[PDB]
Amino acid sequence: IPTDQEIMDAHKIYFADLNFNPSTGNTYINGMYFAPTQTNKEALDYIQKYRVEATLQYSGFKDIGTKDKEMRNYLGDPNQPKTNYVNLRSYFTGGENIMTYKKLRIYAITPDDRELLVLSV
């Protein structure tokens, strides 16, 4: 069973799933990839749920829920294996936009109910 240091270290490389409009400059987050490395398969597969606190456009910094993780091809590359993907479209936002470059916290939920801050921006 992975320790807290191994879990946090497995979530050190992440990429944001973004949609950008060059004409208006607006950016929207769809989700977050956690990269698979040579020494993180166990800690990533050990985590199944993710709690996210995001900055909403009008309601501000709020907890948007705790949802099951998704398994998606890393960076959307079919030639890349499936990895932990926090799909922000399945969390509760009231339809409000998640501010892309504002405060965001992601916690990993272990099967024995430990929560570890794994992403902080």
């Epitope: 909403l56 009008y58 309601s59 501000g60 709020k62 829920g65 479209r89 399945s90 969390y91 509760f92 936002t93 009231g94 339809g95 409000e96």
Partner: antibody
Framework: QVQLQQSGAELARPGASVKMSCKAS????????MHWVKQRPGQGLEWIGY????????SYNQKFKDKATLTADKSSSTAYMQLSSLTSEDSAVYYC?????????????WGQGTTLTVSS | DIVMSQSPSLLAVSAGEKVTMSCKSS????????????LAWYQQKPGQSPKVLIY???TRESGVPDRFTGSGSGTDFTLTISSVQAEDLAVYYC????????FGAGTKLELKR
């Protein structure tokens, strides 16, 4: 295209129970709160309560705390309201309405309404 | 409970007139953190579901004609129709969402004769 499809008209006897539904389509069902509104014939609107389909959190107008029970099924994207111990006061039109905003800001989409008539 | 008082209950209007109706609250609906008034206006024509007109006291919803305008802050609010039209004949409800949700008794518009 967001659409809220409610159940058909209902008749019920006093002291009985009814369960109405609000079929949601065209949006992510778990990212918006579903509210229910009562309107007696000839009278104004009255808020009953809301359910957050993402976590099944509910908030009620205290007038309807014992009367109404809100539920939501994520798999079918359907919101339900159960009314118990029906009296003549419950004969009204009941609307389901989708609410915009993490905090409730406004109702952007409404159902067509479910008519309830309580009579022996 | 936050109490919603709308006046007048009934308003006889003529086509093309400027029409104003008020909604008053028992407590302030202004949220200090966002500086928004959690008050909305809804229109209901007979036999139809209510439709939103204004939210955040003064933000017009997309698709609502420019003749509808909401104003006010704190406890006194106003819905204005710069040129009342035949299709504007309906009942207009104000609604708060600062603490829980409460609808006003509504203001009905009728054709003057």
């Amino acid at each position: 295209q967001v659409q809220l499809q409610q159940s058909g008209a209902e008749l019920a006897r006093p002291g009985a129970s009814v369960k109405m539904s609000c079929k949601a389509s065209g949006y992510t069902f778990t990212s918006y709160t579903m509210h229910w509104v009562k309107q007696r014939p000839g009278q104004g609107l009255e808020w009953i309560g809301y359910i957050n389909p993402s976590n099944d959190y509910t908030s009620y107008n205290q007038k309807f705390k014992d009367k109404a029970t809100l539920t939501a099924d994520k798999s079918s994207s359907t919101a339900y309201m159960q009314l118990s111990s029906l009296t003549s006061e419950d004969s009204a039109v009941y609307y389901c309405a989708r609410c915009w905003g993490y905090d409730p800001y406004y109702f952007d989409y409404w159902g067509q309404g479910t008519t309830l008539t309580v009579s022996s | 409970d936050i109490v919603m008082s709308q006046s007048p209950s009934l308003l006889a209007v003529s086509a093309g007139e400027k029409v104003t109706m008020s909604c008053k609250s028992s407590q302030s609906l202004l949220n200090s953190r966002t500086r928004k008034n959690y008050l909305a206006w809804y229109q209901q024509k007979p036999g139809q579901s209510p439709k939103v007109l204004i939210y955040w006291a003064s933000t017009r919803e997309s698709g609502v004609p420019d003749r509808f305008t909401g104003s006010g802050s704190g406890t006194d609010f106003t819905l204005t129709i710069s040129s009342v039209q035949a299709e504007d004949l309906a009942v207009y409800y104000c609604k708060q969402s600062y603490n829980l949700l409460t609808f006003g008794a509504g203001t009905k518009l009728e054709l003057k004769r």
